[PDB]
Write a protein that binds this ligand. Structure first.
Ligand SMILES: *[C@@H]1O[C@H](CO)[C@@H](O[C@H]2O[C@H](CO)[C@@H](O)[C@H](O)[C@H]2NC(C)=O)[C@H](O)[C@H]1NC(C)=O
Ligand SMILES: *[C@@H]1O[C@H](CO)[C@@H](O)[C@H](O)[C@H]1NC(C)=O
Lengths: 393, 393, 258
């Protein structure tokens, strides 16, 4: 029968945010939280895949002293044509005995290549993504880890401490309603639907599954005329739109998606998208709470800062002399927004001094710090750092 | 219990009635049996069982043979009937391994035995051995061959616009066939390198495995056409005389009497001259690639059989270089990077705001570039190195 | 050249299709066999048919013995075509070598044929009046194991020439108005090996005068005239010429219209 604390932190991975647990009649607590990963897993649906195509040309039917006739069969892009006035030459001489009435029947068609099992591109329908996240919590001085759905519907019971996360403040996904995936990369593309592929373009040949025996394809296959005295089947045909797309694709979402999203395939997922914010519900059990009577209450505390430097990191060092009531753990919180403290919990025993760190951006820092029961003031001057550019949030 | 059909009967495909040594017993009958069952699912069972002969000894190349086909550039410009003619070139491998298919058979002697130091071509009626060591493939520089078996050659060709395949036959006279082929393998990753470096990064790719295990891919084969040869006819001073030379000959004469026929022995047509007659050599005992460069046997219908082929496609790992660390200098909302590329290296940077304004450029030489560092964030991808992150203080 | 073989006389109507059949298969030229199937040589054997092929030779290098057991025992000059010595040497004559040998040649370039027959007898003892009968097939008697030299020699330029690569021909079509002494006849068409359709006539004459398209690989150089003018009557000449192979042929045609 504990208490339910609620807070809101920006959905930014690697930024430690401090909250102040305030239970009536109990010593305050300084919870540090650091989001580790945020998974955006969209529900997908397969439309079709595309691959390099294979032009099948069986041996021509050279009918000597006669005329052949075509028969339009049901093969993808079946291309038949009869040719007159031929005198085919094999090295041993003339195949056809007659001087006239020689015909060559040329057939061809298109099917999936033998390489369509490894080199392929999957065209999917992405909609209504699903979320998941992972967070580090500094509670009881312990770095604990939580993993749940980032929607606020399912809770994690970790050491009798219930944790609820969600829903996402943003319903964003760098994946459009229609996407394409090639084996290591995700692309946004309004791909031509099944039955609308154009020659030279993406998916000049299409198949719902890599195994489905029947496929759809039009590659503008037209048979030319064979050169005189020669047995061959020349064609004109739009080349593979796949290999064209392989050169012509451009960078994937791993390099171009906004908000610094990370893109990973199998499953198609987006990680660490710094968008919106996220709520956190912590139902702390009542057992670990401790009243003020049992809590060390510090009195007659002083603050001193020998050196400080305003920057993104904890560029200031502080030391607090105190007179604690007894030996035990206690918390260290910063009441003000513009000032943050690296420390959250230190050990107090009688009279001693403690060493902590703090961070802000201004030169002259004036703020108050409370140690586990009582406040005190700290003031100093902070220099600028040597770095204008920093490689951490 | 998978059944195959003869013409009126059914039987298990793995146990035909001609067992054992089906081919050696009756060649023509065994091939027709395979042809009639080409569409049935247990065909490849029938093939493994009706071609092996032990005293496994399954050697498919007893039924196939090399052949002559048309080649456009046999060297010195003109076109010739080449015994090393090409059929198709495959460049689906991401590493650039070419899978070349030619009209000779590597690794098989005329007696159908397996031997890697030999290959069999066709010499105007009769296959003949030749030294494998004399085979070569080159585009602009000689290609390093990685595998040879049957009709198929794996090679590593350098950047080139043509492709030549040739060997040296029995009589130490060279044969060669040259086709146009735009060979420039696609670049893996984000840098254009030429020989895998030391430290690098491991990226996915596709290559042609160097094993000769016949598992997945297949080609089509059928009986050869009636092959002509002008040497068969002779002039017995008023008439025509033909010689079979251990084969069967289909002759046709433009005179009286039995002006045509299929003779197994030497025959003579009277009241005729040579120019009125024309004869070819039938051979229903071997198979041949269903090639557009070779006509189809007219008398038989669309009889066809299929045989597996070596060197399938399989995805493996290629290793690419990581570009060296650039020189970094800082400034107010500015990062100055001096890049030292040893080869064409791709550079990309995206802001972590809602408008990333992704910019990329193929950095070629040493260049000092200056990038704005907005408060939202900046991600710099340099070659295949892990993404740099830069923020303002 | 001037080696007139046959003369014709045709009579077509005014404005009808006139075709002068000048067809010769000795001029067929499609593509180079690259000097490897240009000329071939082969010997045959008789028991007594059936005749059996012993070994053949191309214009490139060494020979091929179709029987493996006979290998190394039969030997032609590996440098024959350089000087034309197509003789066959049988080092060890066995009794199964008795029969009727024949030396057959082929010149697919110019479509020639020059054969010769030679009989061989195996005498169990010493020579048995070996060589005779010049007027017909020459027969050689050879003892068991002794060598035999069966002569087949042709020294013509057409055979022993590692020379020009497979192609040079020329076909002229000449015209003679009535009474012309042929000394200064009109030139109409030229057809060359690689192809030069040189039309020499006036512009509105070379619109009906057209040698059939593709007509250098069937050997049918028939001249076509779609409309027949009455003034087009005369003696046309299908001037043929193929040097290096003796084709100084010429066919003549007399075209009359009524
Ligand atoms: C809790 O987790 C944090 C994050 O991993 C730990 O990180 C700190 O430890 C290092 C010790 O030298 C410091 O150098 C790091 O800068 C610091 N890292 C961060 C991100 O703050 C921390 O030690 C852990 N503490 C406990 C009690 O578990
Ligand atoms: C690798 O190839 C197999 C087919 O051999 C395919 O099923 C698999 O999906 C491929 N994997 C990748 C990562 O491309």
């Amino acid at each position: 029968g504990s208490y339910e604390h609620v807070t809101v932190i920006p959905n930014t991975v690697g930024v430690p945010y401090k909250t102040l647990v305030n239970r009536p009649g109990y010593s305050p607590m300084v919870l540090e939280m650091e989001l580790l990963s945020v998974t955006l897993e969209p529900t997908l649906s397969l439309d079709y895949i595309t691959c390099e195509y294979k032009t099948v040309i069986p041996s021509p039917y050279v009918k000597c002293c006669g005329t052949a006739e075509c028969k339009d069969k049901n093969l993808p892009d079946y291309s038949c044509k009869v040719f007159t006035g031929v005198y085919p030459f094999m090295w041993g001489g003339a195949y056809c005995f007659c001087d006239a009435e020689n015909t060559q029947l040329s057939e061809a068609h298109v099917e999936k290549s033998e390489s369509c099992k490894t080199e392929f591109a999957s065209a999917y329908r992405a909609h209504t993504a699903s979320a998941s996240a992972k967070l580090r919590v500094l509670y009881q001085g312990n770095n604990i880890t939580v993993t749940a759905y980032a929607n606020g519907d399912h809770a994690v019971t970790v050491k009798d401490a219930k944790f609820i996360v969600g829903p996402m403040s943003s319903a964003w996904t760098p994946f459009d309603n229609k996407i394409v995936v090639y084996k290591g990369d995700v692309y946004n593309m309004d791909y031509p639907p099944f039955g609308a592929g154009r020659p030279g373009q993406f998916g000049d040949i299409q198949s719902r599954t890599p195994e489905s025996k029947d496929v759809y394809a039009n590659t503008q296959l037209v048979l030319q005329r064979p050169a005189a005295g020669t047995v061959h089947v020349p064609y004109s045909q739009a080349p593979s739109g796949f290999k064209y797309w392989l050169k012509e694709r451009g960078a994937s979402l791993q390099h171009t998606a906004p908000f610094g999203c990370q893109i990973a395939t199998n499953p198609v997922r987006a990680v660490n998208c710094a968008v919106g914010n996220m709520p956190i519900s912590i139902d702390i059990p009542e057992a670990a709470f401790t009243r003020v009577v049992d809590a060390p209450s510090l009195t007659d505390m002083s603050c001193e800062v020998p050196a400080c430097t305003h920057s993104s990191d904890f560029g200031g060092v502080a030391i607090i002399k105190y007179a604690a009531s007894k030996k035990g753990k206690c918390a260290v919180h910063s009441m003000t927004n513009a000032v943050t403290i690296r420390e959250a919990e230190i050990e107090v025993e009688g009279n001693s001094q403690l060493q902590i760190s703090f961070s802000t951006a201004l030169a002259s820092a004036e703020f108050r710090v409370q140690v586990c029961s009582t406040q005190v003031h700290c003031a100093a001057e902070c220099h600028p750092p040597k770095d204008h550019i920093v490689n951490y949030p | 219990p998978v059944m195959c059909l003869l013409a009126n009967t059914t039987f298990p495909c793995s146990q035909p009635p001609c067992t054992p040594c089906c081919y050696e017993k009756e060649p023509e009958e065994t091939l027709r049996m395979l042809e009639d069952n080409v569409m049935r699912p247990g065909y490849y069972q029938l093939l493994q069982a009706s071609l092996t002969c032990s005293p496994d000894n399954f050697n498919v190349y007893k039924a196939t043979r090399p052949y002559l086909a048309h080649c456009p550039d046999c060297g010195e410009g003109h076109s010739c009937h080449s015994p090393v003619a090409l059929e198709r070139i495959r460049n689906e491998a991401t590493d650039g391994t070419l899978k070349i298919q030619v009209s000779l058979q590597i690794g098989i002697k005329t007696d159908d035995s397996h031997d890697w130091t030999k290959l069999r071509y066709m010499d105007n009626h009769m296959p003949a051995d030749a030294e494998r060591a004399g085979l070569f493939v080159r585009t602009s520089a000689p290609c390093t061959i990685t595998g040879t078996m049957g009709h198929f050659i794996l090679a590593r060709c350098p950047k080139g616009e043509t492709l030549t395949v040739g060997f040296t036959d029995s009589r130490k006279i060279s044969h060669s066939c040259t086709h146009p082929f735009h060979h420039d393998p696609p670049v893996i990753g984000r840098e254009k390198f030429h020989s895998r470096p030391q430290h690098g990064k491991e990226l996915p790719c596709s290559t042609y495995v160097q094993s000769t295990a016949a598992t997945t891919e297949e080609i089509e084969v059928h009986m050869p056409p009636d092959t002509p040869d002008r040497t068969l006819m002779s002039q017995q001073s008023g008439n025509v005389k033909i010689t079979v030379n251990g084969q069967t000959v289909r002759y046709k004469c433009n005179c009286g009497g039995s002006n045509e026929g299929l003779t197994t022995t030497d025959k003579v047509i009277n009241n005729c001259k040579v120019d009125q007659c024309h004869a070819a050599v039938t051979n229903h005992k071997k198979w041949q690639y269903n090639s557009p460069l070779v006509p189809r046997n007219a008398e038989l219908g669309d009889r066809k059989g299929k045989i597996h082929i070596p060197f399938p496609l399989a995805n493996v790992t290629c290793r690419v270089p990581k570009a060296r660390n650039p020189t970094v200098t800082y400034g107010k909302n500015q990062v100055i990077m001096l890049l030292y590329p040893d080869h064409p290296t791709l550079l990309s940077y995206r802001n972590m705001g809602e408008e990333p304004n992704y910019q990329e450029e193929w950095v070629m030489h040493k260049k000092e570039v200056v990038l704005t560092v907005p408060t939202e964030g900046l991600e710099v991808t340099w070659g295949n190195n892990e993404p740099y992150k830069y923020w303002p203080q | 050249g001037s080696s007139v073989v046959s003369e014709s006389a045709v009579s077509w109507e005014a404005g009808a299709r006139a075709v002068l059949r000048c067809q010769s298969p000795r001029m067929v030229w499609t593509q180079d066999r690259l000097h490897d199937r240009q000329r071939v040589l082969h010997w045959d054997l008789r028991g007594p048919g059936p005749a059996r092929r012993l070994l053949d030779l191309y214009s490139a290098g060494e020979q091929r013995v179709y029987e493996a057991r006979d290998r190394g025992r039969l030997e032609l000059s590996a440098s024959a075509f350089d000087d034309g010595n197509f003789s066959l040497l049988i080092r060890a004559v066995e009794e199964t070598d008795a029969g009727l040998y024949t030396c057959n040649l082929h010149h697919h370039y110019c479509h020639l044929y020059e054969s010769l027959a030679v009989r061989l007898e195996v005498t169990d003892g010493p020579p048995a009046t070996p060589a005779y009968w010049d007027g017909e097939k020459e027969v050689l008697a050879v003892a068991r194991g002794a060598p035999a030299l069966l002569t087949c020699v042709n020294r013509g330029h057409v055979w022993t020439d590692r020379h020009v690569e497979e192609a040079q021909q020329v076909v002229h079509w000449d015209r003679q108005p009535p009474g012309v002494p042929h000394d200064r006849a009109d030139r109409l068409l030229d057809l060359y090996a690689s192809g030069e359709r040189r039309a020499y006539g006036p512009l509105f004459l070379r619109d009906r005068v057209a040698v059939g398209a593709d007509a250098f690989e069937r050997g049918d150089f028939s001249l076509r005239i779609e409309p027949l003018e009455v003034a087009d009557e005369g003696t046309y000449s299908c001037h043929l010429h193929h040097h290096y192979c003796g084709l100084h042929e010429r066919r003549v045609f007399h075209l009359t219209v009524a």
